Design a binder for these strands. Sequence first.
RNA 1: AUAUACCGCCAUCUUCAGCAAACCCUGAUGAAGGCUACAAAGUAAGCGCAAGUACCCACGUAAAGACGUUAGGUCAAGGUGUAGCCC
Lengths: 132, 220, 338, 51, 63
Amino acid sequence: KNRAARVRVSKGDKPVTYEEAHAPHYIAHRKGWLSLHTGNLDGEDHAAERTVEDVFLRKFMWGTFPGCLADQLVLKRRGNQLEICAVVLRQLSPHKYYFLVGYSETLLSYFYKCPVRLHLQTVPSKVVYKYL
Amino acid sequence: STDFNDKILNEPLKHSDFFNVKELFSVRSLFDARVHLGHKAGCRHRFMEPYIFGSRLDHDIIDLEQTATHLQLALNFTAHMAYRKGIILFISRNRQFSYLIENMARDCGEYAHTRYFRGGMLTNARLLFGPTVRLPDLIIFLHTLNNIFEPHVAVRDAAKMNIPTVGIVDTNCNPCLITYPVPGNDDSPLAVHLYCRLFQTAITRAKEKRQQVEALYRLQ
Amino acid sequence: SFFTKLTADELWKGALAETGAGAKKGRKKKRKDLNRGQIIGEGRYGFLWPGLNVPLMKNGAVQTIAQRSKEEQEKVEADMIQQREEWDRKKKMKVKRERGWSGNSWGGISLGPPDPGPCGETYEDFDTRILEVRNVFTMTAKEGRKKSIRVLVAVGNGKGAAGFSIGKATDRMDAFRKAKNRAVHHLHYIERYEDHTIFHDISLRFKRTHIKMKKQPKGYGLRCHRAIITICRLIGIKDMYAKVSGSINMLSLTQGLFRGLSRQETHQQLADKKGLHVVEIREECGPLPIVVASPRGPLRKDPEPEDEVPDVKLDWEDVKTAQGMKRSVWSNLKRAAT
Amino acid sequence: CPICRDHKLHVDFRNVKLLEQFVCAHTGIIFYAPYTGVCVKQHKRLTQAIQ
Amino acid sequence: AGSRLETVGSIFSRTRDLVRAGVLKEKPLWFDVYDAFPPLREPVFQRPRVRYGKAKAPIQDIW
RNA sequence: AUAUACCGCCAUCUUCAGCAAACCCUGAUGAAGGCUACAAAGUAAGCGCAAGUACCCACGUAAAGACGUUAGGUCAAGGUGUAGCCC
Ligand SMILES: [Mg+2]
Ligand SMILES: [Mg+2]
Ligand SMILES: [Mg+2]
Ligand SMILES: [Mg+2]
Ligand SMILES: [Mg+2]
Ligand SMILES: [Mg+2]
Ligand SMILES: [Mg+2]
Ligand SMILES: [Mg+2]
Ligand SMILES: [Zn+2]
């Protein structure tokens, strides 16, 4: 039985977002990609570097906004600008949100030698696409 | 509110025949409609014996005197419920009279269920229809038997839900759980038409009398 | 390696190992959320980041990056450990449950009022008692042996209204809910004589269970099978004797008890039926007659036959007890108030 | 027991309100010790106080 | 919470008893009409039997 | 060391269509069972099938294929519970 990135059915008490609710075979059919860059296009280079950077960014944001991310990040790369669109929760204080936004922007910019912006979209609670 | 209810709801309960249902029929009318013909003596039901006049050549004859008394009571109950604005639901699985009963229900402003009675219509009503649905206040069985000669499951379900049931019980029926049994012939078109006309007339009389009494009270 | 680290959800899933071949047929560990007490911006170096773990503005001046002294950080860590251990201790400690018939038995345990109904219906007045919990197993084609709970519960208001129900569920709590919600739709009403006992002696047999219930005077107590004591407390009966012979099947016992208590002729019913006064003669009240019920309709002028010798089918146990030949080391024992 | 667990409860012949709780209001007979759970000592004191 | 025990008493008896007990706060719409004009027989469920010995149906042929 | 503690990814029936919570009913309120269309107690959210989608059509092939079975495979992808070594 296929297990890859599938949230198996339950008694109907498990809330799941749009991303979780959709199995791998729905990528490009019902769900897009969480990281957009030119590394994987034909004739382009640095796919491995982009993948490693994406993985580190995801871990770093998860650990830097603990219990705040309401859904997976979206990593967009335009030229050398890196934009992290993050959906977060309206629990942490705005002071701490701003502190962490500035902190993450600066640290990631210095670490990856590129201008990094972090766009937070706040929601009251995790958006539930369906109940599994 | 108190005086309104006292004089509207409880006023008719002080009279033996407030709606005058006895005039709607006579033993002669029932006879002419053939209300007195039952099934063969072999199909007879043990609980229908008290209402059977006899057996004319292995054919049961329903005592139309008892039918007249029972029909008086059933019509009076139906009239009082219609006056009180309760929901009256006509049930019958006789496909020969499904159309007629539905038309009578629509004309008299009440409801009908002449189709396959799905399980739980009454016992599971809140889930099936909605938590705030209003169940019928009276169920009138024009044929208490289903299409396999068994009692309509609605009879048992109505008894469960405490919905009074008027019901025409033939000599092969089981009147034990029917609140107001009316021993009669439920298979002749004449008899079924007479029953439909009687209930329609009683309900219409009750509703119009309710309106008239309300107008009389509210105009003063 | 940083890149080989996972999240708390995945780590706890793997460590606890709820799902698995072991849990398939039962062929402990506690999920501790380690992010509970942690504060964003608190690390072992004791840095005070303005705007994250300390107030941004102090007395109108923007604070600046500072570090707690070593002793201050030690104090903070000690306080954190204190909170952790207090939370763990309060988690480990448990409240003592009020046992039912026995310490480990579900029977006799209260379940609370039945859940409120949809159409503005509430049963706070009702109390629910568990009479039995079983683990019935059925062999299914695919899932080997399948475990289920059959619960018997009795609800009642203590004012006559009482019913019982069987709930089936894979989970014990769902079984309880089903049973106690179904009970309230199947309430009997039991006539109680003077609101403390039954109207007359009842000998009945439901399937292979015989129940012999005796009407008793005030203050006699409930000398009945423990389940009957529970059901009688629910119904509202204070005083009655009851002997259960034959099979002691709990469900047959409950059903037969309710059948007997529901099919009893009140004194008013007897007086109406026989067209006579029903007269009570209490030994405590001397020869004074007490008309407990009188016919609603006319009263018979016929004094009723005086049968010289009754034809009642006596019970050998009653006869033996009356004659004093029943010397049981187990009868008339001293027991807690019931 | 009920008497020994509450030191404010005193078994004294003038404490009729407490003494009544251990006499059946319908028969007037002092409940035997297992009925109420009172120890033998406190039951003897209760019986003496009731008398 | 009307009792769903259609085999125990009649709808009238169950409704009356529950109202007396206080389970039913308000009498159902039909209760007053029933109490005023009851049927000739109280509708209590009875399990039918088959006559076995010398018992015969009291129906007499109409001659 | 332990796949007979697991997460992770899967084989298998599956070249299946059923799994179903929450209710209702039947069986005397036992384990249990719940269908007849000229219908006779079942209603069912959700998952699956189906549908939708990719390739060259609406066909076909992919993909998908639930709940469960084989303590099926993997502690040697990695992580991890328990246990074990630390000159
Ligand atoms: Mg496969
Ligand atoms: Mg007929
Ligand atoms: Mg113990
Ligand atoms: Mg395995
Ligand atoms: Mg394939
Ligand atoms: Mg498909
Ligand atoms: Mg193996
Ligand atoms: Mg192996
Ligand atoms: Zn003591």
